[PDB]
């Protein structure tokens, strides 16, 4: 199957540089023009640059002329976007695409997020949302991870290294008044098998290069040292 997988996607100081990469597979790479299309702040799709199939010719949208260079390695099925003089308006999600040049874009990659900002990157802390009698009903239990205090977006969350996708809700993040992001990822599973299944949320904040894995299990409530207030 066709596959376009971007890399890069970090914080950059205003005025700085960055190389985005795209690995292509599942078709004859050198047969196709290749493009970057970005999803701007507003949520509008905007073509950026296109390199013809041979890497000979390159085309750019006015706003990035003289600042960005698109190139390709036909020996390895790689597409690059070299960016210098980054400015705040360049912040967005950058999709590698297969370009039926002049015309339309018939395959797109997952996207990579470029945040232009003078803030520091910060990785998240990850906390369990343990299933308990407060998250159970109808034989079904909800559990999750709370992913707190990271910048910039995004964090990606998976469960059990990708082997669990059903019943998962990963919520849009909220911007805390610290300027740091927060989000939760939950899943609802059978109560029955909370003693046999192990559930691990996998948190990847690529902009900070931090991965965190966190087992989420039922927590036994009682304690020999305890009081009532």
């Amino acid at each position: 199957e066709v596959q376009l997988v971007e890399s890069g996607g970090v914080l950059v100081k205003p005025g700085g540089s960055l190389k985005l990469s795209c690995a292509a597979s599942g078709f004859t790479f050198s047969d196709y023009a290749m493009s970057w299309v970005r999803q701007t702040p507003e949520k509008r799709l905007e073509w950026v640059a296109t390199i013809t199939d041979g890497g000979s010719y390159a085309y750019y949208t006015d706003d990035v002329k003289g600042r960005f260079t698109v190139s390709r390695d036909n020996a390895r099925n790689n597409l690059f976007l070299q960016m210098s003089h980054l400015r705040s308006e360049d912040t967005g999600i950058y999709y590698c695409s297969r370009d039926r040049w002049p015309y339309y874009f018939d395959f797109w990659g997952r996207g990579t997020t470029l945040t232009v900002s003078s803030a520091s990157t910060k990785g998240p802390s990850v906390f369990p949302l343990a299933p308990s009698s407060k998250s159970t009903s109808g034989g079904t239990a909800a559990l999750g991870c709370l992913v707190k205090d990271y910048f910039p977006e995004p964090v990606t969350v998976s469960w059990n290294s990708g082997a669990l996708t059903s019943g998962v809700h990963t919520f849009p993040a909220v911007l805390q008044s610290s300027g740091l992001y927060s989000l939760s990822s939950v899943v609802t599973v059978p109560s029955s098998s909370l003693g046999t299944q192990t559930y691990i949320c996998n948190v990847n904040h690529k902009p900070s290069n931090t991965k965190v894995d966190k087992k989420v299990e039922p927590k036994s409530c009682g304690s020999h040292h305890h009081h009532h207030h």
Binding site: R44, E46, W47, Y103, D106, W108, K134, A142, H169
Partner: protein, 212 residues
């Protein structure tokens, strides 16, 4: 310059129904048009190109028509997986540009949320902060009110919430709300409660725990 109007900007329509989305252009572009679906987070998908040509792997309930300055995308019987944003794109002159979008919502019957509360992890409390999470799962329509109550006192200013996009299988929404307190403020109250209102609920639903 070359610009487009997409219309409607927003639609809400039931499964099995017929939806037309229209793209009107400022010049005649001689059928040099394409259509795309994008769901939140996820990457765009080509639907239709050259105004009338169905892209491969696209269900045949999609089709496109029109010419000159008037183009249309028609979904024959809408399916729950056809939620998201739809965009037109011209390729008449340079640059190729994109329309503003039509957001498509799947209308369905009412579903009450299931409500779940989570006390702070013991690991977080050791760091000095107490996040309390209230979860509203799989409801419709989107509108849902969360009220935080601490020792029966109406809270305000210490929570934030957010809604998912629409579910591609059941067309419901889910919502997560977090109440944030210092550890010290957390230890001075007993009852932490989440009070939920929705069109699908006659009386409100309260999930609560005692710190213990």
């Amino acid at each position: 310059d070359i610009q487009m109007t997409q219309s409607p900007t927003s639609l809400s329509v039931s499964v099995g129904e017929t939806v037309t989305i229209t793209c009107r252009i400022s010049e005649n572009i001689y059928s040099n048009l394409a259509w795309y679906q994008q769901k939140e987070g996820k990457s765009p998908q080509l639907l239709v190109y050259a105004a009338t040509k169905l892209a491969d792997g696209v269900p045949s309930r999609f089709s496109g028509s029109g010419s000159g300055t008037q183009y249309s995308l028609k979904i024959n019987s809408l399916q729950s997986e056809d939620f998201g944003n739809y965009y037109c794109q011209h390729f008449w002159t340079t640059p190729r540009t994109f329309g503003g979008g039509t957001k498509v919502e799947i209308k369905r019957t009412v579903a009450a949320p299931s409500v779940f509360i989570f006390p702070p992890s013991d690991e977080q409390l050791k760091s000095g902060t107490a996040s309390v999470v209230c979860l509203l799962n799989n409801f419709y329509p989107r509108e849902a009110k969360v009220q935080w109550k601490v020792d029966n006192a109406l809270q305000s200013g210490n929570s934030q919430e957010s809604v998912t996009e629409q579910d591609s299988k059941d067309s419901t929404y889910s919502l997560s709300s977090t109440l944030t307190l210092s550890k010290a403020d957390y230890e001075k109250h007993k009852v932490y409660a989440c009070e939920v209102t929705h069109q699908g609920l006659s009386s409100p639903v309260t999930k609560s725990f005692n710190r213990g």
